[PDB]
Structures are given as C-alpha cells and as structure tokens.
Design an enzyme around this catalytic site. Structure first.
Site, PDB file in Angstrom:
ATOM      1  CG  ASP A   1      -2.333   0.481   0.785  1.00  0.00           C
ATOM      2  OD1 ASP A   1      -2.606   0.554  -0.429  1.00  0.00           O
ATOM      3  OD2 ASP A   1      -3.119   0.799   1.696  1.00  0.00           O
TER       4      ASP A   1
ATOM      5  CE  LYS B   1      -2.761   4.090   2.783  1.00  0.00           C
ATOM      6  NZ  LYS B   1      -2.721   3.655   1.361  1.00  0.00           N
TER       7      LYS B   1
ATOM      8  CE  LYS C   1      -6.433   0.839  -0.339  1.00  0.00           C
ATOM      9  NZ  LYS C   1      -5.259   1.386  -1.087  1.00  0.00           N
TER      10      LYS C   1
ATOM     11  CE  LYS D   1      -7.644  10.080   0.310  1.00  0.00           C
ATOM     12  NZ  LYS D   1      -7.580   8.656   0.782  1.00  0.00           N
TER      13      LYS D   1
HETATM   14  N1  LIG Z   1      -3.893   6.431  -5.874  1.00  0.00           N
HETATM   15  C1  LIG Z   1      -3.552   6.396  -4.595  1.00  0.00           C
HETATM   16  O1  LIG Z   1      -3.340   7.445  -3.986  1.00  0.00           O
HETATM   17  C2  LIG Z   1      -3.345   5.063  -3.928  1.00  0.00           C
HETATM   18  C3  LIG Z   1      -3.609   3.888  -4.638  1.00  0.00           C
HETATM   19  N2  LIG Z   1      -3.334   2.640  -4.054  1.00  0.00           N
HETATM   20  C4  LIG Z   1      -3.739   1.426  -4.781  1.00  0.00           C
HETATM   21  O2  LIG Z   1      -3.144   1.372  -6.038  1.00  0.00           O
HETATM   22  C5  LIG Z   1      -4.014   0.580  -6.897  1.00  0.00           C
HETATM   23  C6  LIG Z   1      -4.246   1.322  -8.199  1.00  0.00           C
HETATM   24  O3  LIG Z   1      -5.105   2.464  -7.945  1.00  0.00           O
HETATM   25  P1  LIG Z   1      -5.792   3.162  -9.170  1.00  0.00           P
HETATM   26  O4  LIG Z   1      -4.916   3.380 -10.322  1.00  0.00           O
HETATM   27  O5  LIG Z   1      -6.514   4.368  -8.681  1.00  0.00           O
HETATM   28  O6  LIG Z   1      -6.972   2.161  -9.531  1.00  0.00           O
HETATM   29  P2  LIG Z   1      -7.653   1.782 -10.875  1.00  0.00           P
HETATM   30  O7  LIG Z   1      -8.842   0.977 -10.605  1.00  0.00           O
HETATM   31  O8  LIG Z   1      -7.908   2.965 -11.681  1.00  0.00           O
HETATM   32  O9  LIG Z   1      -6.507   1.015 -11.670  1.00  0.00           O
HETATM   33  C7  LIG Z   1      -6.203  -0.375 -11.411  1.00  0.00           C
HETATM   34  C8  LIG Z   1      -6.110  -1.073 -12.749  1.00  0.00           C
HETATM   35  O10 LIG Z   1      -5.845  -2.455 -12.455  1.00  0.00           O
HETATM   36  C9  LIG Z   1      -6.426  -3.222 -13.475  1.00  0.00           C
HETATM   37  N3  LIG Z   1      -6.477  -4.592 -12.979  1.00  0.00           N
HETATM   38  C10 LIG Z   1      -7.265  -5.154 -11.980  1.00  0.00           C
HETATM   39  N4  LIG Z   1      -6.930  -6.434 -11.663  1.00  0.00           N
HETATM   40  C11 LIG Z   1      -5.855  -6.674 -12.507  1.00  0.00           C
HETATM   41  C12 LIG Z   1      -4.992  -7.834 -12.677  1.00  0.00           C
HETATM   42  N5  LIG Z   1      -5.151  -8.963 -11.983  1.00  0.00           N
HETATM   43  N6  LIG Z   1      -3.971  -7.726 -13.624  1.00  0.00           N
HETATM   44  C13 LIG Z   1      -3.818  -6.553 -14.372  1.00  0.00           C
HETATM   45  N7  LIG Z   1      -4.566  -5.451 -14.292  1.00  0.00           N
HETATM   46  C14 LIG Z   1      -5.571  -5.559 -13.347  1.00  0.00           C
HETATM   47  C15 LIG Z   1      -7.795  -2.586 -13.622  1.00  0.00           C
HETATM   48  O11 LIG Z   1      -8.413  -2.981 -14.877  1.00  0.00           O
HETATM   49  C16 LIG Z   1      -7.421  -1.091 -13.596  1.00  0.00           C
HETATM   50  O12 LIG Z   1      -7.202  -0.510 -14.895  1.00  0.00           O
HETATM   51  C17 LIG Z   1      -5.265   0.183  -6.091  1.00  0.00           C
HETATM   52  O13 LIG Z   1      -5.152  -1.131  -5.516  1.00  0.00           O
HETATM   53  C18 LIG Z   1      -5.240   1.278  -4.997  1.00  0.00           C
HETATM   54  O14 LIG Z   1      -5.942   0.871  -3.815  1.00  0.00           O
HETATM   55  C19 LIG Z   1      -2.749   2.549  -2.752  1.00  0.00           C
HETATM   56  C20 LIG Z   1      -2.479   3.680  -2.010  1.00  0.00           C
HETATM   57  C21 LIG Z   1      -2.756   4.980  -2.574  1.00  0.00           C
END
Ligand SMILES: NC(=O)C1=CN([C@@H]2O[C@H](COP(=O)(O)OP(=O)(O)OC[C@H]3O[C@@H](n4cnc5c(N)ncnc54)[C@H](O)[C@@H]3O)[C@@H](O)[C@H]2O)C=CC1
Ligand SMILES: NC(=O)C1=CN([C@@H]2O[C@H](COP(=O)(O)OP(=O)(O)OC[C@H]3O[C@@H](n4cnc5c(N)ncnc54)[C@H](O)[C@@H]3O)[C@@H](O)[C@H]2O)C=CC1
Ligand SMILES: NC(=O)C1=CN([C@@H]2O[C@H](COP(=O)(O)OP(=O)(O)OC[C@H]3O[C@@H](n4cnc5c(N)ncnc54)[C@H](O)[C@@H]3O)[C@@H](O)[C@H]2O)C=CC1
EC number: 5.5.1.4
Lengths: 525, 516, 516
Positions: free
Chosen positions: A312, A481, A361, A404
């Site tokens: 995280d 985190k 989370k 957010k």
């Molecule tokens: N943006 C932030 O400030 C923070 C983000 N995170 C984590 O980072 C991650 C990414 O966040 P975002 O980009 O906002 O989310 P998002 O949902 O926009 O992007 C994640 C991408 O992963 C793809 N995906 C899902 N399962 C998959 C798999 N098995 N293999 C390949 N691709 C897959 C989805 O299709 C999506 O395009 C999440 O788990 C989020 O909780 C953690 C801490 C902070």
C-alpha cells in the site's frame, strides 16, 4: 547537472565502482526489574560497493497499467521527458515531478562559512536513474489504450491529455490474469484482456502454473523488445482481498510452488505476478494492501535473492497520519481517538466498495500507528489505558472522482483533564499524489540493486565477500503504509524516521556521518 | 527508572560525569558549475555534567497571576500532592501530559529480537522534577493564585476547589508597569506596581531603581526559601517591539546607561532580563516582543548567564513547524498557508491592540522561512520562490482560553494538481503552554550543569538554542540563522542527551534488519 | 412551460394583467405588563403587470472587464449559443446553475394525491431571459472580454477558446477613475479613463462633465442597439465609504451642486448612480460602499427610478443569513461567529487595502443584527445580548478566484452546553456571483413592469427591497430596518409572484393531510 564531491579517505573509486568504508554503531538494551536500562553499544565495520554505471534506460512493468495511476505514471514520464507544456485556465504550465521525494526534495550536506545550512537535491549525492529514462509497459485486464485510459481516469488537464494523445494512444496493456473472486464483482465487465481463458474462450482459474510461465515470458519478451538490461515490476492494480495462509499451502517456498501447480484457491493473481518476478530475478513492489507476500513467497525471495517490497502506497491521509500521530506522541501528548473517513469516485473506490476488498485497505491504514503507541508506556499502559480508538472508513461517492476527500479527527488528552482536537479536511488528488511515489519507489529500488557490501574483520583485511541487501527492501518504507518486514522484526511507520534512514544511507555512501543537528558551531563557545 | 551505558567514553569523578565526544560536521561550497564540495570537519570534546542537581528549584514567573502562570502553579501542586479531582467523566488523576520532558520517550537501542527499546526522556540523565519547583513571581495585578485560577477559567471547577487552600497562599509580587508597552485596555488590571511617583501614580521615571528592586526580589526569594538555583521566565502580556538604536540599546554599556536615563526604548521585559542576567539567573522569554536587543545579548555574553526564547511554540505554530516541513521534505510545494486564530482570554484581549498583535504576527510568520529556503528545486526565480502566508488573531470572548486555530495549507502537485489541507484545531492554550513552560525550566536547569572543553571547561554559549523546540522564533547567535523544524529540534536534544552517556546519533539505518 | 390560474381576481386587458389583492398585516404595541396588543390591518390593491416584456434587454456593467463582468458575458453567450465545452470530466453543456430565477422552482399547489407540484420560478409570469441580454459597460482597463476572461482565470480553458471569437469583439467603454476611492495598487490597471486633463493625466476636476458623458454613453448604447430598456449594475472595485455631510450630499439639490463643484465626497459610483437615475435606468450596487447617500435616494425618489443593492450576497454571507437564522429560530443561542476569508483575484487585491476592506467588513457583519434583535428570551441584559462577530479578508494570490471561507459558529445550549459548527467553504466567487447578477437584472426588469393602486397607478417605492435575497446589506426606506434572513427574503418574492396570479401566501398548513 548538479553533483557532490566529498573529500574523504573513506571513499575510493575504481572502474566505475565506489567503495566506501563505514562503521555502523548501535546498541543492545535489556531492562532490569528494578527499572534500569542496561545499554551495551555495538559496532560493525563495513565496506559498501556502489556500481556507478546506471542503466541508460530502466524497464518498468506495471500491473494495472491502464488504471488511474498507471496511465498517469506514463503521462508524467512522457510530459517531463519531452517538456510538454500544456494549457490551463491559469495559463501555460510546465511539467514537473512535484510530489516526488527523490526528484524534488533536498538534503543538508553541511554548513557554509557563516555556519548556516547548505542543501543539495536528494538525487544529486549519488547517481540515480531519472524517471525520464523509464521505458514503461505492463498488464491490465482491460484492453483500453493509454489515451482512452487518461480519458477514463479524468485525472489530467484536458489540454495535456490532448497533447499526449498521439503517443498515449499507441500504448496498449498486455493481457493479464483475472481470477474473479479476488477483486470486486463489479469489475467483471471491465475484464476483456485476459490470458487465462479456457478452450471456449472463458475466464478460468485452471492452469495457474501456465499463467505463471506466461508472465515470466512476458517479462523476458518486454526486456529484449526494448534492448533493456534491467526491469522492475510494480503492482498498481485493483486491491485484492486477503488470501488465507495455511500450513501445507503457502507457508513455505516448496508448498507455494506446488499449490500454484495445483491451482490452489489461495493463489491470487498478485501471488502469481510476485512469484514470476522473483523467479526472473526482477524486483517486485506491492503498491496495494492485499497480503501478497505470504511466508512461502518471502521464502522464495530469500532463496532467489530477489528484492520485494510494499503493501500500500502511503500517499495522503495515511502519510499525514504517520507524521501527526508521531508528532503528538513525541511531544508527550496522548491521542485517544483517531477517526479517518474517506470518499472517492474512481475505480479504486468502486472496487473498494466491496467489503472483502475494503478489509485489506482497512488493515494497512489502521496499522500505521501501532508502533508509535507501543513506544511510549508513560502515556499508554495498564493504569491509564493503552488503547487508541481508531476507525477507518472508505465510501464510494462517484461525483468527487479521483479527488479523494479525507476527513479526520485527532482527539488527544492533555494534562489535568484537558484535550486537543484537530479536525482535518484533506482533498487528495489521488493519482497526482501516488504517481510520484511510484516513481520514487522505482528510482530507489533501482539504486539499491547497484549496492553491495561486506562486513569488515578488524584483524583480517579483505575478509568475506560482497552481498546484496536482505530481500525485503525496508528502505522503501517511506512510501508504504504497512512495511513488509524481515521475520521477527516489527515495522517502524514514522515518516520522518523513514526519510532519515534513507538520508543517512546516502550520506554514509559518500563518507558522511549521520545528521545529528547538534550544531556545536553555534551552541558552544 | 535509570539508564546505564557500558562505555569507556564516560568516567565518574566526585558526582561529576566526564564524557569524551568527537563532533563531526562538514563545510560546503558550491561552484558555478553546480558542484558541491564537501569538506568534513572534526573536533573532540570532553563534556562535564554536574550530577548533583538542586533538591528544590526556584522559579520566578513574570505574569504569575495570568492564565499560564496560575495553571503552572496548579499543575505543580496537583501532581506533587496527587490531587485527584472530579469531572463529569469521573475521577481523574493529575499528570504532566503535553510535557515532552516528562511524558515522551527516547529510543535507547534494540532488544535481542532487533526491535526498539524506549525509555523516558528524563531518565537518561538526572533532571529536576517539576514536583520540586518552588514558585514565586510578579504580576501587575495582586490577585492571589486561587483568584487567578477562577479568573482564568482554565481548570476543572472541582480541581480549583481542591487546590483553593494552597493556591490562596500564593500572591504575586508587585511589578513594573510601563503603560505604553502593552494594550491600553490593561490599565484597570494594574494595581500591583512598584513604579509609582510621589502622588502614587504609575511612572516611567527611575527605571534604574526599578531594576535594582527586581534584583532585590530575586535575592530575597533565594534567601527566604534557602534556594541556590533560580530561573526567571516571562509569561506576561505580549509587549510591542522597541526600536534598536545606536548608542541606546546596541551595546551592554549603552543599554545600562539608557536604563539609568529612563530611555523610552527600555521596556519592562528589558529590565527583568537585565536584572536576571545581573543576578546570574537564566531568563526565558515566553512572549514574542524583541526583548533581547543587542546590548542585552552582550550583557548575557559578558556575564555568562543563559537567555532564550521568544514565544512559546504551543499549538498552531507547533503543528506548522511539523506540517510545512513534512510537505517540503516530501517534494510537495506549499504556495499558500493561511492561519487564523480567535480566543477570549486576557492574552487575546491584549493582542486585540495592533502594536501587541504585530509582535505575535512576526513570530508565527517566520517559522517557515528556513524551510522554504532549503529547497531551490521547488522555490526559485523560474517557478516562484514565495509562499503566501497570513497570520490573524482575533479577540472573541465566548471561546475563552480554548483558542480556535483554523488553517489552510494549499500546495502544488505535479502536472497542475494541488493538495488542500484545511484544519480546525481547538487549543486549550494554557494546558498546552503550561507543560512547555515546565519543559523549558527543566531543560534550562539541566543545561546549567553542563560544561565542556576542546581536546579549562566552559559553559554553553549564552543563547540556549537547544530550547528551540519550545519556541516560535528561536533567538540566535549573531550571524546564525534559526532552524524551526520541530523534529530536527527534538533530534538535537535527543542526540545531546545520547552523547553525554556515550551513545552516537540516532541513524535509523537498522542494519540488523536491512543487511544479511 | 406556463401557468394558468382559474381566478376572478385576475383580468387581462390589452397585454395587461390586472389583479385584485387584499393585503393584511397587523400593528403591535406592548404594555409594561408584557401584553402584546395586536390590531390587524387591511388594504386592498389592484396590481397591473405589463405583459409585454422587451425582446432584448440592455445591460451596462460598471467593471465589465472584471472577473464577474467577463463571466457574465461568457455565461450569456455560452447559454444563448449552446456552447458545449471540453473538460477532464468530459463534454459539458452550459447552464445557469446558481441562478434562483433560472434554476429554482416554486410550489403551485398539490396534486390529486395531496402532494406538492412544483414549477419553475420564472414560469409563473413572463420574465426576460438572460439569453436575451445585450451587454456593454465601462472599465478603467481597456482589455477586451476575451483578454478579460484569460486574466480572470475563472472559466475552463476550452470554454474560453470556444468563446474567443465572440468575446474578443466586446471592449469596455472608458470610465471615471478617482484614485483615492479604491486601492492604490489599482493605478497600473487604469488605462481607459474619460476624466483626463490637458496634459492627459487623470483628474478629479470636471465631475459634472464626467456625469454628462456617462449619460451620453447610456443614450448611445440604447440608440446603437435599438433598445428601449436598459439596466445599469455596479460590479467594479469596492470603493471606500464617503462621508455624508449636511449641505453636500444630504439632499437631491445639494448633491447635484456638489458634483458641479467637484466635491471630494463625490465618488465614481456616486456619478454612475446619478447619471443612471437621470436617464431613468435602474441602478444596482453590487458592492459594499455607501453609494446611495441621502441626496441620491432623494434623486431616485424624485425621478421615480429604481435603485438597489449594496454587496452581492453570494457565499459566506449567504450561508450565514441561513445558518444564524436557523439557530435562533430553533431556540439555540449563537454567542461567537468568526468568519475568515482569503482569495487571490483582483477583488481580493483591492480589498487588501484598509479603506476598501472596511466597506466590506460592514456589509458582512450586519447580516445578523436583525436576527439577534428578534429574540429577547436569548438576548437580553440578564443573559447578555451580544454575539461576538469578526470578519476577516486576506489577499492570498495562489487560490485565485476560488475564495476560501472558514467560519466557526459557537452557540450555547441548555445547562452549560455548547454547539460548535466549523466550516470550510470553497467559493468559486465569479461562478457564484454571476448567476446572482443575472437574477438581479431579471427581477429588476420584472419590477419595472409592475404598477398598483389602492382600492392612478404608481410604481414601486424607488428602493427595490424585493431584491434583498441577493444583497448583503439591503438598502432600506428611511426609518425601516432591513430583514436579512434568506428564506424570508425568498418567501417575499415567492408570495409576490403568487399574488399577481391570484394565489394566496404559502402557509404550509396542509389541512388536506393534517385534518380528517
Ligand atoms: N492512488 C492512490 O493514492 C493510492 C492507490 N493505491 C492502490 O493502487 C491501486 C491502483 O489504484 P488506481 O490506479 O486508482 O486504480 P484503478 O482501478 O484505476 O486502476 C487499477 C487497474 O488495475 C487493473 N487490474 C485489476 N486487476 C488486474 C490484474 N489482476 N492484472 C492486471 N490489471 C488488473 C484494472 O483494470 C485497472 O485498470 C489500487 O489497488 C489502490 O488501492 C494505494 C495507495 C494509494
Ligand atoms: N498560552 C499559550 O499557548 C501561549 C502564550 N504565549 C504568551 O504567554 C504570555 C502569557 O499568556 P497568558 O497567561 O495566557 O496571558 P494572561 O494575560 O492571562 O497572563 C499574563 C499576566 O501578565 C501580567 N502582566 C502584564 N504585564 C506585566 C508586567 N509588566 N509585569 C508583571 N506581570 C505583568 C498580567 O496581569 C497577567 O496576569 C502572553 O504574552 C502570551 O502571548 C505565547 C505562546 C503561546
Ligand atoms: N464575486 C463575488 O462573489 C462578489 C463580488 N462582489 C463585488 O463585486 C465587485 C466586482 O468583483 P470582481 O469582478 O471579482 O472584481 P474585479 O476586480 O475582477 O473586477 C472589477 C472591475 O472593475 C473595474 N473598475 C474599477 N474601478 C472602476 C471604475 N471606477 N469604473 C469602471 N470600472 C472600474 C476594474 O478594472 C475591474 O476590471 C467588487 O466590488 C466585489 O467586492 C460583492 C459580493 C460578492
């Protein structure tokens, strides 16, 4: 180009290699029943070796490449590398890497003739790869190209997206592994780019070892197609639910590998990606909260000697918490209630709306204060109470999009029945906060792959041989985190201590001692 | 609780601790080509710590009958006598929460498992306990401390009643009241003054005689209570600044002559500081006025007596010295920091006047200057090197001592993004400030028992910058710039205590875990 | 969308609506014994509404090139021509959100089920649409409106580009610049002035000639565009107050003579108001300066032309006129209301100067006075009848037009309790203000078509208090006190529209549900 040159006999250069002598001091402590602390200082000398020849290009493979963070990461690299200025209602803006500690923070090197501090860029002490030299690819269960990904994410300025359209439109995510039960059910419609399809072209969890072999090959393929020598893999895909850790399944390296071949239900997609990266000798970073690094996987990393890290990204609400909670306790103030609420409207939030995904989370965000509380038994003990009520809430509210909203209340006790109440409203443009941290993790991980060391024997010159860091790169804790740790060791979450560790490490490599802030030039006659 | 370090750097001789320490630093120069040339420096020292601390420490507070002064005495009495008190949440036991010296801990090292082991901040070396403070002081108002508590409306009613008998016995000595230095609305409050004329009216004439009386008050306090060590701390109304003029208060000699001449640039705080320095008692300024003019710093340097201060860093500014530092250290660029405050106690009443407010505007505003100057990647001519910063303090009687701080930290992120942190901080001012006053006194006393020599022992340079953690605008040695970051300020104190017991600086390298 | 009421109170004759209405009220007197003697009163009227509204309405804005002025023109053009625009959230369609006349609804009655049926506020009677506004105006700066939009940084970049061709065509007429009435920092901005001397330098001499030129500008605007109806609205820099002196600006006659004499108490707004009144065009003051001095109110009364205003009530004050009222209506007692603001646009830049800030401090502070005077159970001599209230406005460039309002409402509850409401309100000032300017223009035009007689028709008393909903400090008829509660202000407008179509006041009694 800014550089640093320290006059010291502790450092010697030879064939693109820097060799630095360092005496590491610490102390072991025991506590008597009488309440006496017996402190025994310890010392161990080392010689650190740093390969000064950094890769001209660094391969980056992001799992979840088409997401908010993945697409924003690619956009930031392209924008900065090609100086893509863009239009906004505040005028023409120049791209930068603000929010990146490695690219935009400075470190004190010493004082000037007047006794005042002199600072230099964090990335100027020793050679580090620039994000401008990142060659990025990766996987995503959704096939949208990166221009479509930017449109979807609604993170970047419209004009910037348009200027990056031609290039981003050509970047297409490689198909990935989609095991339905590990992420929110509402993500089903999004999966149209999968490698795990059966004879009838339907998603299947059968053949997990074959999926593993495909990922390893994907890495090899990416490497050769870009004439690259080094690659790093980072997970930035949907947060998965936790997997159960049970004896005989994923408790050991042997059992883990067999469980994958057996298509065991405790093997998640991240488990496969981590295993594949480890087997290829490619560093793997977990930017999500699921418990990817089960004991069997840590064992595998230890055996292969491949770097792993994560759990995280610590980007907003939790980053501030790792600063505020530490500050209050260090000051002798006693937090007793910390309520942390969050609402966002991106796919991260959409996926987190499912209880099993949210749970992952909840744990990472809640654990950040545990060590801080345990460090002070004057405030936290059986007589006065040793608990801090702490609640974490995340709700999906589509209208706010990627911005957010974090709302927190830190309620603390002061002397004689008094209290301190700090209420906060923090608007976190999640992808803009996260992207530079992803960049930092990649830059620092690459740097660590060029560092080796050996213990020095006081009575025997050149004894022993060089070794690499213990596999779990805890030096990356500043950006995570819930820091993964070496078995037996507890994590340290205080942000400032985490940065100090990195600072003192870079300092010792160039022959400088720890920052002490003693300033005797001013305090003493 | 105690600490014993196995080391050959420390030796004990006649209740005296002698510690060897090698101080390392580095001098830096930057070339036009952008190259930083770093030259390490080293200086060995031998520090001496008088292990014999006073059994009782005399404390004389200027502004003794105020919110902070009366709360300080109440806190000492409540803790010393274990005065539990009733509240609607039940019976509560007194404590020193909010005090860094009494309630924070420091890492001594790791255990057999490789995990941190912490010990009380005041357990590494002997320090005086606030429970052993003997307190007196001055106030332009003669209300006894029980009446002062009632007036302040800071403490739980039941606690006030349980402390009534003891607090009623404490009465502030009359003080020096020069009307033009504080808010005009404080006139009706002054009924305890030593500076009166033949008609019995307040007068600014005879300032040297006022100075001599303060010296007498200090001498008498010591004698009456058989105390050998005393510390004076200013916790009275914030004064307006005085002008620093050549020939007036620029030198030690001119300063004393200006006092004898009843010069208008001599404020009451100026006299208290001079009297304290002349009596050899440390003087701490808990307010923002520029008490320590050049001539006074000279006097302290000449007499070799400790001085320190300029505004307690208790709430909004304390948090700012943490948050602003955090953002810049992270590569994030604050561009706007708005800080608003409203309170309804006498501090706020006094601060409602422009000249008094000005003093506080400066101390609260300067806390980020060093932070901003430390990063030229973010702050430079091309991208802009300024951070808009505003400080506002309004008098709103209904909130009383529970000052309300409202802030907004607006910063720039990459690609045109921003981060906006809005805060509402309810600061029970006296309960936040009192433990800091305690810390300042405890740490100052400790410093008076420390001497050192390069390798005749000498004492610290007069300006005790080690106390910066508790002050908004750290007074500094000529030519030296202050460092406001709270964490660095605590680190300085931590490493000082550590080196005295033979331990090196905290490095957080944790090689036991990071290396094979 | 339209509304047709079946009633014998309304009759149509030659595009004219005649409506009978019986106005009821009551006069009250209170005896020493505490008895309220209420005597109901009644007065019958016949209202006449000219149903023929102008096909195009002329609008002349003073401060046309400012944030609000340029946003007003952009909003009219965008909506009139359906200019959809790109944003990072996708293509958006223009609208008039934030406008009470264009986007709010009113309850007309109930349906067969007994549940409310709502209709658009502007559908009960014919009103001019902002889409039919023809806009011109004055500004001391000659930038065209496209350049003004760029300068303001209010609108989405893509929208600005799509409106570029049309906005580039609009250029502000030169205006009257009397340096001492606005912030000195506005000097470099003035390059479009009619008041110049022989050397071509700005001058305060010849004020009567300046007045005649403004009248000419109005006449020309009407003729050029073949418009028969025009309204002037002040949306320029907030001015400092002028002093009201006997023989100077106390009477209609003295006022005009003072202008001819170039008196220092004659501000630019004074001249624009006089010129508008003399041309018979309604004049609305969207700023807080005291433009409407007695002599000007007299002039308007004499000429029978509408005047109104004194500060748009758009964000922090609008919310306050809702929250403070809510608390007191509930029997809760606010005792402290702290209101802080920081913004980085030219409005904030101008307001950074004390004299200009003072004008705004008054309008924002007075909004709760009537509310507090209405409840003597909570506010009286025994319990205290004051509410501490502070207004602060700081210039912080980085936030631009997105003004940040931070407030704390601290109130008393029973048995010593309290309620504390802390707010952080991000106000995109121009987007909040623009639709209010639109509302003021739409409602003012409507009022010019209304006449009435007790049962010769007469027009409304010159001061259009019906526009109070949109103003912070409602100008009032001599002797009358303003009513600031937002809901009551909207209720007044609602019931006015209702009575014109033969409907009684909203009563919320809902006897269809409450009674058997
Ligand atoms: N943006 C932030 O400030 C923070 C983000 N995170 C984590 O980072 C991650 C990414 O966040 P975002 O980009 O906002 O989310 P998002 O949902 O926009 O992007 C994640 C991408 O992963 C793809 N995906 C899902 N399962 C998959 C798999 N098995 N293999 C390949 N691709 C897959 C989805 O299709 C999506 O395009 C999440 O788990 C989020 O909780 C953690 C801490 C902070
Ligand atoms: N409480 C807090 O959190 C902080 C307080 N401070 C400062 O500490 C000081 C004390 O604060 P409070 O106790 O709340 O104020 P206070 O007004 O309640 O107490 C100050 C006392 O000083 C007395 N006094 C005024 N001029 C004097 C003189 N020349 N000699 C002797 N007594 C004099 C007054 O009669 C009063 O009783 C103020 O200057 C305040 O600005 C600074 C930072 C934080
Ligand atoms: N935007 C809001 O939410 C509210 C605005 N207001 C007031 O509305 C007014 C306009 O606000 P903004 O458009 O933001 O300010 P602004 O400063 O951007 O625009 C005012 C314009 O007036 C012009 N100007 C100054 N003196 C003039 C004169 N004598 N004749 C002609 N033009 C002159 C200036 O050159 C400027 O372009 C200000 O007085 C402001 O205090 C009042 C309540 C709310």
């Amino acid at each position: 180009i800014t550089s640093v040159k320290v006059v010291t006999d502790k450092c010697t250069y030879k064939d693109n290699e820097l060799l630095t002598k360092y005496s590491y001091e610490n102390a072991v402590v025991t506590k008597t029943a009488s309440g006496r602390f017996d402190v025994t200082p310890t010392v161990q000398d080392y010689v650190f070796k740093l390969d000064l020849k950094k890769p001209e290009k660094l391969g980056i493979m992001l799992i979840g490449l088409g997401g908010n963070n993945g697409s924003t990461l690619v956009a930031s690299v392209l924008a900065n590398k090609h100086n893509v200025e863009f239009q906004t209602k505040e005028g023409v803006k120049q791209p930068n890497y603000f929010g990146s500690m490695t690219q935009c923070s400075t470190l004190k090197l010493g004082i000037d003739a007047e006794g005042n501090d002199v600072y230099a860029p964090f990335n100027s002490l020793l050679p580090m790869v620039s994000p401008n030299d990142f060659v990025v690819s990766g996987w995503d269960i959704n096939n949208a190209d990166l221009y479509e990904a930017m449109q979807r994410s609604q993170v970047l300025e419209y004009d910037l997206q348009q200027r990056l359209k031609a290039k981003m439109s050509l970047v297409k995510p490689l198909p990935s592994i989609y095991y339905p039960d590990f992420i929110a059910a509402n993500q089903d419609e999004r999966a149209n780019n999968c490698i795990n399809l059966d004879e009838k072209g339907n998603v299947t969890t059968r053949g997990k070892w074959t999926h593993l072999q495909r990922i390893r090959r994907d890495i090899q393929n990416f490497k050769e197609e870009n004439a690259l020598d080094k690659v790093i893999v980072l997970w930035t895909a949907n947060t998965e639910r936790y997997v159960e850790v049970s004896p005989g399944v994923n408790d050991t390296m042997e059992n883990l590998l067999q469980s994958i071949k057996n298509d065991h239900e405790e093997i998640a997609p991240s488990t496969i990606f981590a295993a594949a990266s480890i087997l290829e000798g490619v560093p793997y970073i977990n930017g999500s909260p699921q418990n990817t690094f089960v004991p069997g996987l840590v064992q595998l990393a230890e055996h292969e000697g491949t770097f792993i890290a994560g759990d995280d990204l610590k980007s907003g609400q939790t980053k501030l918490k790792s600063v505020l909670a530490q500050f209050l306790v260090d000051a002798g103030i006693k937090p007793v209630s910390i309520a942390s609420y969050n609402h966002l409207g991106n796919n991260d939030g959409y996926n987190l709306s499912a209880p099993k995904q949210f749970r992952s989370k909840e744990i990472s965000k809640s654990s950040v204060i545990d060590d801080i509380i345990a460090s002070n038994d004057i405030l936290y003990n059986d007589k006065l109470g040793k608990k801090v009520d702490h609640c974490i809430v995340i709700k999906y509210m589509k209208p706010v999009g990627d911005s957010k909203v974090a709302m927190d209340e830190y309620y603390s006790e002061l002397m004689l029945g008094g209290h301190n109440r700090i209420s906060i409203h923090n608007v976190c443009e999640d992808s803009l906060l996260a992207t530079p941290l992803i960049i930092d993790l990649l830059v620092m991980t690459e740097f660590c792959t060029r560092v080796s060391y050996k213990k020095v024997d006081p009575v025997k010159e050149d004894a022993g041989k060089f070794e690499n860091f213990y596999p779990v790169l805890t030096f990356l804790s500043y950006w995570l985190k819930a820091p993964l740790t070496r078995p037996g060791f507890h994590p340290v979450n205080g942000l400032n201590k985490q940065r100090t560790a990195l600072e003192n490490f870079l300092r010792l490599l160039i022959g400088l001692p720890s920052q002490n802030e003693l300033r005797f030039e001013e305090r003493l006659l």
